[PDB]
Amino acid sequence: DTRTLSQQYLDDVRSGAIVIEGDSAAVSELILKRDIPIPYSYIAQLFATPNAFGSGPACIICHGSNNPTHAYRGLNLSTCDGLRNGSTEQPARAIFTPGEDPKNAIIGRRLRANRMPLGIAFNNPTDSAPILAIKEWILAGAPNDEHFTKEILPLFATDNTFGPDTPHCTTCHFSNQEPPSFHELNLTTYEGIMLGADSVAKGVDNATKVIIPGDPEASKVFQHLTEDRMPPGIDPSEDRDHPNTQILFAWIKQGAKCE
Amino acid sequence: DTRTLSQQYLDDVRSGAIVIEGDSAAVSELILKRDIPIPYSYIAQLFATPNAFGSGPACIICHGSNNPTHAYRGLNLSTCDGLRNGSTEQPARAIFTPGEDPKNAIIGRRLRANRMPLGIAFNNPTDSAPILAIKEWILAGAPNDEHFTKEILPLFATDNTFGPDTPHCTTCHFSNQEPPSFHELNLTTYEGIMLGADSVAKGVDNATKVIIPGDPEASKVFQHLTEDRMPPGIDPSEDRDHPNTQILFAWIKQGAKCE
Amino acid sequence: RTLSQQYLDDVRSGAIVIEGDSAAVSELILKRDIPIPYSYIAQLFATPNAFGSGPACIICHGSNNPTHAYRGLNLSTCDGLRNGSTEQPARAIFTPGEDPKNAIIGRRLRANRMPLGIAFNNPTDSAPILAIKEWILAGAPNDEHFTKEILPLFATDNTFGPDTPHCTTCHFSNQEPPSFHELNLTTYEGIMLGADSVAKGVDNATKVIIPGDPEASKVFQHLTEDRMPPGIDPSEDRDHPNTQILFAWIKQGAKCE
Numbered sequence A, B: 001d002t003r004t005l006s007q008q009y010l011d012d013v014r015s016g017a018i019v020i021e022g023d024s025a026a027v028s029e030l031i032l033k034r035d036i037p038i039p040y041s042y043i044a045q046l047f048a049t050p051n052a053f054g055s056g057p058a059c060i061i062c063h064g065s066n067n068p069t070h071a072y073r074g075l076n077l078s079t080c081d082g083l084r085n086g087s088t089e090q091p092a093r094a095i096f097t098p099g100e101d102p103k104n105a106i107i108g109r110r111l112r113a114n115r116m117p118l119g120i121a122f123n124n125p126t127d128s129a130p131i132l133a134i135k136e137w138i139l140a141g142a143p144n145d146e147h148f149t150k151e152i153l154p155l156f157a158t159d160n161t162f163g164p165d166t167p168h169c170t171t172c173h174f175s176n177q178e179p180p181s182f183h184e185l186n187l188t189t190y191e192g193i194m195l196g197a198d199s200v201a202k203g204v205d206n207a208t209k210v211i212i213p214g215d216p217e218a219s220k221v222f223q224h225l226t227e228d229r230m231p232p233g234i235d236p237s238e239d240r241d242h243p244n245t246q247i248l249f250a251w252i253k254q255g256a257k258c259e
Numbered sequence C: 001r002t003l004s005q006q007y008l009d010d011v012r013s014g015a016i017v018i019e020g021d022s023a024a025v026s027e028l029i030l031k032r033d034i035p036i037p038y039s040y041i042a043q044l045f046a047t048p049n050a051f052g053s054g055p056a057c058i059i060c061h062g063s064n065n066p067t068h069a070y071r072g073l074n075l076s077t078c079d080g081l082r083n084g085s086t087e088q089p090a091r092a093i094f095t096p097g098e099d100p101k102n103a104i105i106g107r108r109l110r111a112n113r114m115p116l117g118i119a120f121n122n123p124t125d126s127a128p129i130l131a132i133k134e135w136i137l138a139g140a141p142n143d144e145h146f147t148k149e150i151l152p153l154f155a156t157d158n159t160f161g162p163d164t165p166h167c168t169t170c171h172f173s174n175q176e177p178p179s180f181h182e183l184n185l186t187t188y189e190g191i192m193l194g195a196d197s198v199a200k201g202v203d204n205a206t207k208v209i210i211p212g213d214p215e216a217s218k219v220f221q222h223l224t225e226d227r228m229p230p231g232i233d234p235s236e237d238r239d240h241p242n243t244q245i246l247f248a249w250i251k252q253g254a255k256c257e
């Protein structure tokens, strides 16, 4: 306001306006809430340092060029224009959009979204028959037909469908009750699937839909089935809301500026 | 005098001159004792990296500019001259002096000194009424009068004085013997407060004076009451003598050179 | 085929195998020979705990000036790395394009000083060590002098430092447990046979004594070389991913790109 950070701070401690709820309160209340500008120099350091978002190798080792024989997906995370360009190998695509919330863009999911069924190792195929079966079903408008009930619905209910020694989805997702069904997602019936997640904990018409008929690419189910969290092999129990993840998101929302 | 580092090393393992007590033996005995020059590049990396002096966000996020609307206190820790300039927002002040021991300068206190009462959260006011009373009392020459006995002395003995759900000072500071009273500081009486800390182990007057009559700014009591340890929210039990802190001090003592 | 293409082909083949937390590095970075950029390597020597607990390498090895850097060794620059130690006795710490596993840089990162746990403030030139060095120089014979004066050094407590166990505590047979690296130091034949004799053939065994040459002898190396950074705890991972990436870079030519 022409007001200094210090002044807003001193006013905020009087007010009681700052609330400390968790280990990441410094980041949450003083950095994100105050919209402090994030320098690209810090962002560069995140992609270059190991364990920057949770245990594993530095992103730039495997994604350090727009050459597809030196870097996976022709994705260059080591430069500001590279980040903005995204994957250059066909099918080429951006991994976020400057100025927009990246939480559910490709970069957001790769940092925060555990592959399903939870715990499955990255060396299991993401193009397997069951996955492609679901992809096609979603494409066909995700109908509730004979075919679905017979050939698709049991994929969520059978052990070892997407890899050896893996539990059926409905082990963890079988009701809309807060525990024991995670995210209150119920994958036992057609209706449970199209209802989506968190319908009890949030609005029933603010429920997180997991199937988007006509669109496999935007379907949380298909995304979770096909996207390995980064860096590859990162354990599921690693914090999905790492402060560096949040500082990264802030930088993107601020324009992904090379300044 | 004229020996190489290696030569002094080989001499000292023979002498028994090198002594090992803690994980930081490498640092204390081989780096600090030999005044190995610290490169600014390393120092820069310390303020730019999360957890560099203990758990928390990187300094340069909150202190990355001399613009007080982009950086707390207009303090720029991200450049060498920025470090040398210190806080630029009024009241502007240096946080250290090149060539001088920074242990008890503002930079040293912010890294090593836990705010009191120990454990208190940073969203409590540092200018509250009790703090101003104590400050006033110190300004007036810290007399042992009626006002002190009635209005100041009990501030060290009452729960929740400096914030909600905080223990009274005399919980941990009530005698001059090493356990159970921390740093042998006794705040139950006037004489104990003016005697200070560390009176048995180094003193009784090689003791750390904690009240400097006439000068609240230099008084450890007032400092510990008003200064939050950095980064904000850092847990008190985090090492106060982190090797990176010591390396930082070394760099400052060596002239704070920009290479 | 591209990296992505070799990857997707490899997951279908069953070609990728996962054994440890460090699976990503071994199978996706080392096995596909992704080029390692010097900029990353630089950051390794400049960051504390990069290869395991301890100060950043460049603090102690940050110049070719021996009053500013141990051994006049500069790890902070690419030409510095290739140069190695400049203080007499000057020597390179690796050779570009060759596996550095057993070069000086490799031993200082992976080889715990022996006997395991001995502190770095113990002399690496003590009488027992010179005795062993001399015995190796003389061709490592199995004579009277060896049996009476050398062999017992490996079976006696507090030989190489105060409160240190006899070597044969951990090295007395050729099986993975209980004898580490299948090394048997109780007999002449055991010492000359070496390590890894079961896991490799008996004629692919890793020799730990190289007669005539102490500098190249694994026994003498372990007795005299402190793992870096000084004071690093022995139980620290000897196969740190950063160590492996470093080795990859060196093998790739140690390019200043």
Ligand code: HEC
Pocket: A053, A057, A058, A059, A060, A061, A062, A063, A072, A073, A075, A087, A093, A095, A106, A107, A110, A111, A230, A231, A232, C004, C005, C007, C008, C024, C025, C028, C029
């Ligand atoms: C080598 C072990 C890698 C490390 C280190 C990182 N990633 Fe990764 N990434 C890797 C693979 C094998 C793949 C899949 C390639 C394929 O063709 O299927 C990916 C993919 C991504 C993507 C998606 C790109 C797209 O166009 O959809 C992203 C956004 C991504 N990786 C990000 C990322 C991050 C943030 C990393 C550091 C935490 C990281 N990668 C490291 C292999 C490796």
Ligand code: HEC
Pocket: A113, A114, A116, A117, A118, A119, A156, A162, A167, A168, A169, A170, A171, A172, A173, A182, A183, A185, A197, A198, A208, A210, A220, A221, A224, A225, A236
């Ligand atoms: C227990 C080991 C589970 C198995 C088996 C499956 N899922 Fe899962 N899922 C689980 C948890 C703990 C979470 C929360 C997110 C996290 O990583 O902790 C999830 C989340 C999902 C979601 C997203 C819900 C949302 O609100 O966005 C989806 C769409 C999902 N899971 C789908 C899914 C599928 C298709 C499964 C069979 C392959 C499956 N889950 C199994 C725990 C577990």
Ligand code: HEC
Pocket: A006, A007, A009, A010, A026, A027, A030, A031, B047, B053, B056, B057, B058, B059, B060, B061, B062, B063, B072, B073, B075, B087, B093, B095, B106, B107, B110, B111, B230, B231, B232
């Ligand atoms: C945001 C979460 C911050 C982080 C990261 C760091 N600091 Fe900080 N600092 C922050 C605030 C809100 C304040 C108080 C402002 C006020 O008006 O009271 C401070 C204060 C300091 C100071 C004191 C400057 C002075 O003039 O007295 C110093 C020297 C300081 N901080 C240093 C510092 C260090 C070393 C950090 C990394 C360990 C660090 N800061 C991070 C907020 C935040």
Ligand code: HEC
Pocket: B113, B114, B116, B117, B118, B119, B156, B162, B167, B168, B169, B170, B171, B172, B173, B182, B183, B185, B197, B198, B208, B210, B220, B221, B224, B225, B236
């Ligand atoms: C127990 C939770 C404590 C409470 C209550 C108070 N203090 Fe404390 N103090 C405590 C410890 C463990 C230490 C050592 C430093 C550290 O953080 O580990 C201290 C130190 C001080 C000092 C410094 C003495 C010195 O040698 O510099 C002072 C001046 C001090 N404490 C003052 C103080 C005040 C004013 C308190 C009530 C508001 C108070 N302490 C409470 C532990 C505890």
Ligand code: HEC
Pocket: B006, B007, B009, B010, B026, B027, B030, B031, C045, C051, C054, C055, C056, C057, C058, C059, C060, C061, C070, C071, C073, C085, C091, C093, C104, C105, C108, C109, C228, C229, C230
């Ligand atoms: C100070 C605590 C040091 C740290 C940090 C690192 N090293 Fe070190 N190094 C140190 C000493 C005292 C010595 C012995 C010198 C002598 O005269 O005996 C060494 C030696 C080495 C060597 C050997 C060079 C040679 O000519 O044989 C190497 C290759 C080495 N150190 C590497 C190294 C690495 C990789 C480090 C970071 C993990 C590192 N050193 C840090 C002191 C210190």
Ligand code: HEC
Pocket: C110, C111, C112, C113, C114, C115, C116, C117, C154, C160, C165, C166, C167, C168, C169, C170, C171, C180, C181, C183, C195, C196, C206, C208, C218, C219, C222, C223
């Ligand atoms: C138990 C505390 C041990 C004592 C006593 C000795 N060694 Fe050791 N050794 C031990 C381990 C766990 C290992 C694995 C590698 C590592 O650095 O941790 C080793 C290895 C060796 C080797 C290397 C063989 C190879 O790499 O192929 C040698 C040559 C060796 N040890 C020799 C040795 C000597 C001379 C000892 C007495 C001074 C000694 N060892 C004692 C565990 C233990």
Ligand SMILES: [Cu+2]
Pocket: A001, A002, A003
């Ligand atoms: Cu305004």
